[PDB]
Design a binder for this molecule. Structure first.
Ligand SMILES: Oc1ccc2cn[nH]c2c1
Ligand SMILES: Oc1ccc2cn[nH]c2c1
Ligand SMILES: [Cl-]
Lengths: 208, 208
């Protein structure tokens, strides 16, 4: 029921760079993950303009941020277009092989890690703060699946018989023991205002 | 053989804002149009990773910038994924109705016109410098078409029996009589280095 996979060599390389490189401005992870959800929401909005029944699986387009101090997680939920099984396998629907290449050689021209969005592999900045990332996704054209990794050079894909969700994607960050400041009402507020104030969709910060 | 269309009200509104608003930093148009081609190239790269025959219509992924002083044009060419007829009609494959809304109210929160990319309607900044824009496009799943507008609240779509191009999109800017500095070898070089130095694809500046 659980399939295990090896990251392509270039992505494994990137993930190891992100975990090991001394770099203080970790807060950008949220900008990047919010930005990816906004892009998924654009995609089902475009699609629905021609066939309005794509929105049958949930008529609202939004982003939610859910801190939990017990499980030491922060969840980012969107009701975007979602990913198909094959999407999950193909580096979470990105061009990671070529994107990592362009990024790696952009650190040759003096650029720093905050520029990771510009290359299209910004999802992996989640490894600035998380020790394990579980992505749950449901796309109209397929079933619900769960993807999971703690780096190490491999990820798993199972089908998910937990919570039906209708449509979208959930990125559960299981945070590193020294990064719990990103569970703080105050601190998430500041980061959302600094780096994400003009996102076209409503962002609800949940309270505990 | 030539169909004429009315822009939706919100897009007409935006275009009129871009043409009339006093605003000096016009140079961003190139950043935005380059950025859109990069996004089209990402899309056929993603597609080709699963079915490699999508690249049968041209194996190279690149951007070219072509100044012409005679016809007073600057052409930006990419061999991206291209647009289908319906794409051309739907605001050049963008979410323009909602995007213009989010943008218009972002000028309520102090943001300026250079932030147009963040809302997904950056193609229209071309109206900072061009008086007429002709877009030529060929997508694997359809024929070659030509879209054209001088604003005025309407655009045309004809099928194009000029140059076969295989796959991609060409954005011909017919420049305003006072914006010919964007035909200068020197000046295009500076703008590409300032705002576009980390684009993952090769950009060839043609010389005349
Ligand atoms: O951070 C991410 C990464 C991938 C997807 C797909 N949908 N939403 C996402 C968010
Ligand atoms: O500036 C643009 C706008 C739309 C498309 C589509 N493909 N390439 C483009 C460039
Ligand atoms: Cl983008």
């Amino acid at each position: 029921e659980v399939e295990t996979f090896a990251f392509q060599a270039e992505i494994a390389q990137l993930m190891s760079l992100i975990i090991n490189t001394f770099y203080s401005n970790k807060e950008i992870f949220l900008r990047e993950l919010i930005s990816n959800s906004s892009d998924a929401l654009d995609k089902i909005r475009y699609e629905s303009l021609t066939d309005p029944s794509k929105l049958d699986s949930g008529k609202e387009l939004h982003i939610n941020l859910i801190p939990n101090k017990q499980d030491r997680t922060l969840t980012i939920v969107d009701t975007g277009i979602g990913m198909t099984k094959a999407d999950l396998i193909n580096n979470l629907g990105t061009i990671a092989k070529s994107g990592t290449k362009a990024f790696m050689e952009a650190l040759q021209a003096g650029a720093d890690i905050s520029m990771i969005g510009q290359f299209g592999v910004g999802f992996y900045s989640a490894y600035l703060v998380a020790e394990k990332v579980t992505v749950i996704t449901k796309h109209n054209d397929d079933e619900q699946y769960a993807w999971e990794s703690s780096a190490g050079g491999s990820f798993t894909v199972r089908t998910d018989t937990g919570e039906p969700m209708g449509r979208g994607t959930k990125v559960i960050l299981h945070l590193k023991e020294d990064q719990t400041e990103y569970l703080e009402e105050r601190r998430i507020k500041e980061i959302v205002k600094k780096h994400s104030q003009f996102i076209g969709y409503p962002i609800t910060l949940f309270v505990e």
